[PDB]
Amino acid sequence: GSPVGAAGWRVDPWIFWAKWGSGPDLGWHPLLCHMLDVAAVTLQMWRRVLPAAWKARISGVLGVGQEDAERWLAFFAGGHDIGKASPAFQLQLRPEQGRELVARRLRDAGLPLFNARAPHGTISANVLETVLADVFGLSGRSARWVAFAVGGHHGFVPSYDEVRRDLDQQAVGWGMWDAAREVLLCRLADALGLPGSSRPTVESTPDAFMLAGLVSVADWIGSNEEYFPYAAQSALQVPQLDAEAYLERAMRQAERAMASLGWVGWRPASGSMRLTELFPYIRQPTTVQAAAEELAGEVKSPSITIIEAPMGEGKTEAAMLLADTFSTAHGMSGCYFALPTMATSNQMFGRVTDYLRHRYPEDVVVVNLVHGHSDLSALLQELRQKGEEIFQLQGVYDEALGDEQLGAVVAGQWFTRGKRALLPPYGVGTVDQALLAVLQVKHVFVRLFALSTKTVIVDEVHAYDVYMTTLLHRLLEWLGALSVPVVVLSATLPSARRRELVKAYARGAGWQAERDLPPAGYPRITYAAAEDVRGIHFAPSEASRRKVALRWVSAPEHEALGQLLAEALSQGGCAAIICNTVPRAQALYSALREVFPGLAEDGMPELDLLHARYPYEEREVREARTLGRFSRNGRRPHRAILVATQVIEQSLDLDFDLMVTDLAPVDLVLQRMGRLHRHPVHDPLRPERLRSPELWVVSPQVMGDVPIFDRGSASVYDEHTLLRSWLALRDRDTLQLPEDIEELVEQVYSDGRVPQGASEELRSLWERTFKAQQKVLREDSLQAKYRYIKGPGYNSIWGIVTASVEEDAPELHPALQALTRLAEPSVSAVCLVAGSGGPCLPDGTPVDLDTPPDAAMAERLLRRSVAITDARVLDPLLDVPVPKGWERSSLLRGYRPLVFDASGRAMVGRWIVRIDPELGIVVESP
Ligand code: NI
Ligand code: NI
Ligand code: NI
């Protein structure tokens, strides 16, 4: 019973606040200004950033024309903070920043005051779900969907009960507050020209869901005070503004901010280029590239493509040629390049840069070189490079963080951390960043939205990963719903995997056509579209036709391994030994120092070690040395040995005369084997003993016929898979490539239960390990409701994510990533030295843990960073609090100080942790 009189309808919109300053900044930003800012950011996104296919698709989903869909999207995005016009939010002010002035200001307007609290986004959902219908004429489902999606902007879309049951009425207010919000919303809509345009339809769940990500990003752009200064110079006075002129200035500011981010202006300027043109360095295209070039002329706008060729065949140029065809011919301006988990992004960027120069004006040089990167080195150089190049946020009022500056920090991690690579139209990063889009994590919809504008290339997919997890399948479903073109690259996939992946993308795209996948010989390119489903075989390159000698080194021989290496390398040659874990690599290297004490031509020892567990600058040094020795253009040593973990297995473009590896799932052993004699140019200079390729696998202890895998390998990989791999490999003397790649992988995963007629204990090991594996998969399937987001076909906008909603901000990497086995759980730590006056840099300045670092000091700290993953110290390290200055820093939030003494020792739980100049971080028992 709240009849508002005309005096109540008067109100004056500008009195309400959305942002407020703290200390040096005494000013504040009116809510109508903020809504106009986010709407302006949305308009400029529509006009200068978003790819044409995305605009056409979303306009079609909305059922209206493009200008109309644009103005309405700007309306919803601007309307994201309408819930701030409540007593609960307006009264939030600190007394020292003038809460009383605002209180008198609202009291003069006749607005009732209540001290009840509620997050403003939930309030926004609660008001929009009715007002968007009763006033603006949207259907109730449309109003509801927009209300929830828009109301989720701070991290999670609200649960149904939060909006429609558990929300206190005093927090929202009614009568006068409804009239005030109606006035703000109407002035917003009039500023964007909504009357009397045709009403949009927003009843598609997946689309509303990623649109929430668009809203969050537009709010982040609107939160940069450098580009969006607060309109009110003081708490004492209310600005007298014109909404239209302010919208114009807001549009200029939005264009400037996004220009600073490098989001403009990627105009393809067609164009219609062949593969030799985009990649001049190649002479004769490889057969896979030729088949892709032939495929390119008929590819459909929403489609999935799977490319299976032996490693070194150049699948990436084919993939990029396809993405280029998508951008030029199908309006998909943009691409995310999803590199393998262990892979560093580093070597890959330059290729993308070169492709960009051949398609875009040299403005590329001003943009991607800073922005498409996710590697830490780009962040370091960007920090060293004056001026303040890092985009910065303030006044992000996240409900479940202590304060708005903390919310601004957590939101600004999107411009500091590796996930930043998602944002730009072109970006290169880890596949994990894309895979997170289907986890129940904060701002998943932001990841769905960032992916929604690009074609997606998944580099180096392994059979083991698509067998052990469903992450890629789910992501493919969501990508299919959002009409995102996808190219998956792999050395080989079992047919069941190709089928389930293509079926996942098709299931997401709604392709009701059910007709079968066409079988084709390896190597091959599978392809699928609406009316089209192809399977194209092509001939392997003659260079791919090799015989690889296979050799086992058993447990009794395992310390003769140094001797076997000595005889094999007596005439020199480059050799690599891939261990499955860091401790195994450190141990093997330490054992190997006696056998190879010599110095290489680069002035560094011929024996070398490479793994991720080093402070980052040391990683840079060791990696530069490794690339310097074993890369295709590198100065190849007469003799060198590299002990390394799987960071070599998936990243660097290396070539070795001899390969040794721990037993692993066969696709991974083959992937490691792809570095063996990788570059033909090195052939003439190879030592005579090593001219015929050889793969040594370290044999497990064998009791009778029953293998006993080492604990580290058993912990890293599924043991049944290790067993199947060992069974498939043990009798072999010679591998016949290309064909043995697909043959071995198909044998290990795809189907055959082959005990082969052996001991009862071996059979028991088979059945037991298989039972454990299946129990793991089944347990992940039953627990899926607590881990994965709902698929695209889910009935309602609410409940796509349920728990731990708005915590905030819940993992993410330490927890959910591990349970879904997206990646190993880990702790980020900064290595420092002990001393009075607190922790120090190694040379030798004191560190202030109590205050956030400046960009230079943060650069120095990040140089000391390392990602600990060893299980023994992981928990005790997490028990160490993140220092209060670091938690208020977007650059260093989540990092843990790790203070070694003068001896390089530090106590961590029951364990000694040691910083070794040769070994890197070493965990050992006292
Ligand atoms: Ni908000
Ligand atoms: Ni906002
Ligand atoms: Ni906000």
PDB file of N, CA, C and O and ligand atoms in Angstrom, residues 18-19 34 80-81 84 120 153-154 219 223 395-397, ligand 3:
ATOM      1  N   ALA A  18      26.905   5.605  -6.755  1.00  0.00           N
ATOM      2  CA  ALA A  18      27.338   4.254  -7.115  1.00  0.00           C
ATOM      3  C   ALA A  18      28.789   4.005  -6.709  1.00  0.00           C
ATOM      4  O   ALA A  18      29.169   2.881  -6.394  1.00  0.00           O
ATOM      5  N   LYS A  19      29.596   5.062  -6.724  1.00  0.00           N
ATOM      6  CA  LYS A  19      30.990   4.980  -6.297  1.00  0.00           C
ATOM      7  C   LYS A  19      31.274   6.099  -5.304  1.00  0.00           C
ATOM      8  O   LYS A  19      30.692   7.181  -5.392  1.00  0.00           O
ATOM      9  N   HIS A  34      27.120   6.259 -13.513  1.00  0.00           N
ATOM     10  CA  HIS A  34      27.749   4.953 -13.633  1.00  0.00           C
ATOM     11  C   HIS A  34      26.994   4.072 -14.616  1.00  0.00           C
ATOM     12  O   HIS A  34      27.601   3.361 -15.424  1.00  0.00           O
ATOM     13  N   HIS A  80      22.659  -2.842 -14.593  1.00  0.00           N
ATOM     14  CA  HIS A  80      23.257  -3.797 -13.657  1.00  0.00           C
ATOM     15  C   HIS A  80      23.313  -3.318 -12.200  1.00  0.00           C
ATOM     16  O   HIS A  80      23.249  -4.134 -11.280  1.00  0.00           O
ATOM     17  N   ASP A  81      23.436  -2.010 -11.989  1.00  0.00           N
ATOM     18  CA  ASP A  81      23.598  -1.462 -10.641  1.00  0.00           C
ATOM     19  C   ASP A  81      22.365  -0.743 -10.096  1.00  0.00           C
ATOM     20  O   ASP A  81      22.473   0.070  -9.176  1.00  0.00           O
ATOM     21  N   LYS A  84      21.628  -0.570  -6.414  1.00  0.00           N
ATOM     22  CA  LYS A  84      22.320   0.392  -5.563  1.00  0.00           C
ATOM     23  C   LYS A  84      21.381   1.498  -5.086  1.00  0.00           C
ATOM     24  O   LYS A  84      21.633   2.138  -4.066  1.00  0.00           O
ATOM     25  N   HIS A 120      23.800  -5.615  -3.567  1.00  0.00           N
ATOM     26  CA  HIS A 120      23.061  -4.779  -4.506  1.00  0.00           C
ATOM     27  C   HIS A 120      22.689  -5.482  -5.810  1.00  0.00           C
ATOM     28  O   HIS A 120      21.720  -5.098  -6.460  1.00  0.00           O
ATOM     29  N   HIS A 153      26.634  -9.860 -11.733  1.00  0.00           N
ATOM     30  CA  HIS A 153      27.854  -9.229 -12.247  1.00  0.00           C
ATOM     31  C   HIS A 153      29.069  -9.265 -11.317  1.00  0.00           C
ATOM     32  O   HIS A 153      30.206  -9.205 -11.782  1.00  0.00           O
ATOM     33  N   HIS A 154      28.837  -9.370 -10.015  1.00  0.00           N
ATOM     34  CA  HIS A 154      29.941  -9.386  -9.057  1.00  0.00           C
ATOM     35  C   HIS A 154      30.609 -10.743  -8.831  1.00  0.00           C
ATOM     36  O   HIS A 154      31.549 -10.843  -8.045  1.00  0.00           O
ATOM     37  N   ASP A 219      31.270  -3.377 -16.613  1.00  0.00           N
ATOM     38  CA  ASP A 219      31.420  -2.748 -15.305  1.00  0.00           C
ATOM     39  C   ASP A 219      32.891  -2.547 -14.922  1.00  0.00           C
ATOM     40  O   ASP A 219      33.253  -1.515 -14.335  1.00  0.00           O
ATOM     41  N   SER A 223      34.844   0.966 -14.171  1.00  0.00           N
ATOM     42  CA  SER A 223      35.431   1.182 -12.852  1.00  0.00           C
ATOM     43  C   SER A 223      36.853   1.760 -12.861  1.00  0.00           C
ATOM     44  O   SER A 223      37.455   1.948 -11.803  1.00  0.00           O
ATOM     45  N   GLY A 395      36.583   0.926  -6.601  1.00  0.00           N
ATOM     46  CA  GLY A 395      35.167   1.013  -6.321  1.00  0.00           C
ATOM     47  C   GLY A 395      34.354  -0.128  -6.896  1.00  0.00           C
ATOM     48  O   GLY A 395      33.244   0.083  -7.374  1.00  0.00           O
ATOM     49  N   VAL A 396      34.913  -1.333  -6.885  1.00  0.00           N
ATOM     50  CA  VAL A 396      34.140  -2.517  -7.236  1.00  0.00           C
ATOM     51  C   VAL A 396      33.542  -3.101  -5.963  1.00  0.00           C
ATOM     52  O   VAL A 396      34.242  -3.719  -5.164  1.00  0.00           O
ATOM     53  N   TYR A 397      32.243  -2.892  -5.775  1.00  0.00           N
ATOM     54  CA  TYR A 397      31.591  -3.203  -4.507  1.00  0.00           C
ATOM     55  C   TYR A 397      31.143  -4.654  -4.399  1.00  0.00           C
ATOM     56  O   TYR A 397      29.947  -4.934  -4.302  1.00  0.00           O
TER      57      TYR A 397
HETATM   58 NI    NI B   3      30.184  -1.978  -9.132  1.00  0.00          NI
END
